């Protein structure tokens, strides 16, 4: 059972840090904001950028 | 413009009578895709069987193992594009008003010469 403990310790070594990308998050946020902007423009007729 | 045919073609150019669509494909094949080639798109569940012309590519390094993103028929909405459009419209308006300030000042300037002409003619008539 000692090697089970050794493997569990080695598996506890792993850093609990999960790097998450920022460029894709920004692009998705921009797309959703654009959807909201288009909705608001449509509800205002055409008195906006387009 | 003054004639009616030019106005008709301008009006035809001024509107869009078809839905605005943008297509995005995640491609993971071995064949590379260039910026000019036109591919054939077949996708039965989405009812696609056509020819697609590439308009946008987001490629990765050949050793990066990642997928490729390819766009057709213009791009998705996005906000930074809207901000760029607003900024360029603002710049155009700014240059327009800067020009028209000088134009109005010249209109004031062009008035004094004609005032002088009127005064000279009034003196001559007397």
GROMACS .gro file of C-alpha atoms in nm:
model
  176
    1UNK     CA    1   0.000   0.000   0.000
    2UNK     CA    2   0.309   0.220   0.027
    3UNK     CA    3   0.329   0.275  -0.350
    4UNK     CA    4  -0.038   0.376  -0.345
    5UNK     CA    5   0.059   0.644  -0.093
    6UNK     CA    6   0.357   0.748  -0.305
    7UNK     CA    7   0.143   0.782  -0.617
    8UNK     CA    8  -0.123   0.975  -0.423
    9UNK     CA    9   0.144   1.214  -0.294
   10UNK     CA   10   0.290   1.258  -0.644
   11UNK     CA   11  -0.066   1.324  -0.765
   12UNK     CA   12  -0.115   1.577  -0.485
   13UNK     CA   13   0.194   1.761  -0.611
   14UNK     CA   14   0.001   1.904  -0.910
   15UNK     CA   15  -0.054   2.280  -0.896
   16UNK     CA   16  -0.423   2.367  -0.840
   17UNK     CA   17  -0.391   2.654  -1.089
   18UNK     CA   18  -0.588   2.635  -1.414
   19UNK     CA   19  -0.470   2.894  -1.668
   20UNK     CA   20  -0.773   3.030  -1.855
   21UNK     CA   21  -0.731   3.229  -2.175
   22UNK     CA   22  -0.829   3.596  -2.191
   23UNK     CA   23  -0.843   3.664  -2.566
   24UNK     CA   24  -1.132   3.424  -2.629
   25UNK     CA   25  -1.315   3.557  -2.323
   26UNK     CA   26  -1.277   3.912  -2.453
   27UNK     CA   27  -1.393   3.814  -2.802
   28UNK     CA   28  -1.702   3.635  -2.670
   29UNK     CA   29  -1.782   3.928  -2.439
   30UNK     CA   30  -1.750   4.163  -2.736
   31UNK     CA   31  -1.982   3.944  -2.946
   32UNK     CA   32  -2.247   3.934  -2.673
   33UNK     CA   33  -2.220   4.310  -2.623
   34UNK     CA   34  -2.262   4.353  -2.999
   35UNK     CA   35  -2.575   4.139  -2.985
   36UNK     CA   36  -2.712   4.360  -2.708
   37UNK     CA   37  -2.621   4.675  -2.903
   38UNK     CA   38  -2.795   4.544  -3.215
   39UNK     CA   39  -3.104   4.461  -3.008
   40UNK     CA   40  -3.112   4.810  -2.858
   41UNK     CA   41  -3.061   4.972  -3.199
   42UNK     CA   42  -3.344   4.766  -3.349
   43UNK     CA   43  -3.576   4.865  -3.064
   44UNK     CA   44  -3.484   5.229  -3.140
   45UNK     CA   45  -3.566   5.205  -3.510
   46UNK     CA   46  -3.244   5.300  -3.684
   47UNK     CA   47  -3.122   5.591  -3.471
   48UNK     CA   48  -2.782   5.436  -3.405
   49UNK     CA   49  -2.461   5.345  -3.589
   50UNK     CA   50  -2.671   5.157  -3.846
   51UNK     CA   51  -2.663   6.383  -5.983
   52UNK     CA   52  -2.954   6.512  -6.190
   53UNK     CA   53  -3.085   6.231  -6.410
   54UNK     CA   54  -3.309   5.948  -6.290
   55UNK     CA   55  -3.112   5.639  -6.399
   56UNK     CA   56  -2.814   5.730  -6.180
   57UNK     CA   57  -3.053   5.790  -5.891
   58UNK     CA   58  -3.213   5.451  -5.955
   59UNK     CA   59  -2.881   5.266  -5.951
   60UNK     CA   60  -2.774   5.461  -5.641
   61UNK     CA   61  -3.098   5.369  -5.463
   62UNK     CA   62  -3.050   5.005  -5.562
   63UNK     CA   63  -2.700   5.022  -5.413
   64UNK     CA   64  -2.839   5.190  -5.100
   65UNK     CA   65  -3.038   4.895  -4.958
   66UNK     CA   66  -2.991   4.527  -4.877
   67UNK     CA   67  -3.279   4.297  -4.974
   68UNK     CA   68  -3.130   3.967  -4.851
   69UNK     CA   69  -3.061   3.844  -4.495
   70UNK     CA   70  -2.710   3.923  -4.377
   71UNK     CA   71  -2.535   3.591  -4.314
   72UNK     CA   72  -2.187   3.500  -4.191
   73UNK     CA   73  -2.045   3.147  -4.190
   74UNK     CA   74  -1.768   3.012  -3.965
   75UNK     CA   75  -1.606   2.669  -3.999
   76UNK     CA   76  -1.363   2.487  -3.770
   77UNK     CA   77  -1.139   2.289  -4.006
   78UNK     CA   78  -0.898   2.015  -3.895
   79UNK     CA   79  -0.783   1.857  -4.221
   80UNK     CA   80  -0.439   1.795  -4.366
   81UNK     CA   81  -0.484   2.007  -4.680
   82UNK     CA   82  -0.378   2.370  -4.621
   83UNK     CA   83  -0.618   2.651  -4.705
   84UNK     CA   84  -0.497   2.969  -4.877
   85UNK     CA   85  -0.651   3.315  -4.895
   86UNK     CA   86  -0.779   3.281  -5.253
   87UNK     CA   87  -0.906   2.925  -5.298
   88UNK     CA   88  -1.280   2.857  -5.324
   89UNK     CA   89  -1.388   2.533  -5.157
   90UNK     CA   90  -1.697   2.315  -5.185
   91UNK     CA   91  -1.905   2.298  -4.867
   92UNK     CA   92  -2.128   1.994  -4.806
   93UNK     CA   93  -2.310   1.971  -4.471
   94UNK     CA   94  -2.636   1.774  -4.485
   95UNK     CA   95  -2.774   1.844  -4.133
   96UNK     CA   96  -2.743   2.220  -4.192
   97UNK     CA   97  -2.863   2.194  -4.552
   98UNK     CA   98  -2.545   2.318  -4.720
   99UNK     CA   99  -2.423   2.212  -5.064
  100UNK     CA  100  -2.251   2.508  -5.228
  101UNK     CA  101  -1.923   2.678  -5.316
  102UNK     CA  102  -1.771   2.891  -5.039
  103UNK     CA  103  -1.514   3.166  -5.091
  104UNK     CA  104  -1.274   3.225  -4.802
  105UNK     CA  105  -1.288   3.574  -4.653
  106UNK     CA  106  -1.122   3.525  -4.312
  107UNK     CA  107  -0.861   3.283  -4.177
  108UNK     CA  108  -0.733   3.232  -3.822
  109UNK     CA  109  -0.459   2.973  -3.864
  110UNK     CA  110  -0.228   2.822  -3.604
  111UNK     CA  111   0.133   2.716  -3.634
  112UNK     CA  112   0.178   2.383  -3.818
  113UNK     CA  113   0.323   2.234  -3.497
  114UNK     CA  114   0.050   2.377  -3.273
  115UNK     CA  115  -0.198   2.088  -3.323
  116UNK     CA  116  -0.483   2.339  -3.299
  117UNK     CA  117  -0.780   2.373  -3.533
  118UNK     CA  118  -0.820   2.636  -3.804
  119UNK     CA  119  -1.103   2.889  -3.814
  120UNK     CA  120  -1.225   2.997  -4.159
  121UNK     CA  121  -1.491   3.257  -4.239
  122UNK     CA  122  -1.717   3.317  -4.538
  123UNK     CA  123  -1.966   3.588  -4.637
  124UNK     CA  124  -1.834   3.869  -4.415
  125UNK     CA  125  -1.776   3.848  -4.040
  126UNK     CA  126  -1.974   3.841  -3.717
  127UNK     CA  127  -2.094   4.166  -3.561
  128UNK     CA  128  -1.849   4.228  -3.272
  129UNK     CA  129  -1.824   4.555  -3.079
  130UNK     CA  130  -1.472   4.677  -3.162
  131UNK     CA  131  -1.584   4.703  -3.525
  132UNK     CA  132  -1.878   4.919  -3.415
  133UNK     CA  133  -1.644   5.139  -3.211
  134UNK     CA  134  -1.413   5.180  -3.512
  135UNK     CA  135  -1.711   5.280  -3.727
  136UNK     CA  136  -1.826   5.532  -3.466
  137UNK     CA  137  -1.474   5.674  -3.435
  138UNK     CA  138  -1.429   5.718  -3.809
  139UNK     CA  139  -1.773   5.880  -3.838
  140UNK     CA  140  -1.671   6.115  -3.556
  141UNK     CA  141  -1.350   6.203  -3.739
  142UNK     CA  142  -1.542   6.269  -4.062
  143UNK     CA  143  -1.787   6.496  -3.878
  144UNK     CA  144  -1.497   6.679  -3.711
  145UNK     CA  145  -1.321   6.748  -4.040
  146UNK     CA  146  -1.655   6.851  -4.194
  147UNK     CA  147  -1.725   7.109  -3.923
  148UNK     CA  148  -1.363   7.231  -3.933
  149UNK     CA  149  -1.398   7.290  -4.308
  150UNK     CA  150  -1.739   7.453  -4.273
  151UNK     CA  151  -1.615   7.695  -4.006
  152UNK     CA  152  -1.365   7.831  -4.259
  153UNK     CA  153  -1.634   7.823  -4.528
  154UNK     CA  154  -1.868   8.034  -4.314
  155UNK     CA  155  -1.585   8.274  -4.231
  156UNK     CA  156  -1.514   8.310  -4.604
  157UNK     CA  157  -1.885   8.374  -4.659
  158UNK     CA  158  -1.845   8.657  -4.408
  159UNK     CA  159  -1.523   8.760  -4.583
  160UNK     CA  160  -1.685   8.747  -4.927
  161UNK     CA  161  -1.959   8.978  -4.796
  162UNK     CA  162  -1.735   9.279  -4.729
  163UNK     CA  163  -1.611   9.303  -5.089
  164UNK     CA  164  -1.967   9.314  -5.221
  165UNK     CA  165  -2.056   9.569  -4.951
  166UNK     CA  166  -1.772   9.783  -5.088
  167UNK     CA  167  -1.909   9.738  -5.441
  168UNK     CA  168  -2.256   9.847  -5.325
  169UNK     CA  169  -2.111  10.152  -5.148
  170UNK     CA  170  -1.906  10.252  -5.454
  171UNK     CA  171  -2.210  10.216  -5.679
  172UNK     CA  172  -2.423  10.419  -5.438
  173UNK     CA  173  -2.164  10.698  -5.440
  174UNK     CA  174  -2.143  10.684  -5.821
  175UNK     CA  175  -2.521  10.704  -5.857
  176UNK     CA  176  -2.543  11.014  -5.637
   0.00000   0.00000   0.00000
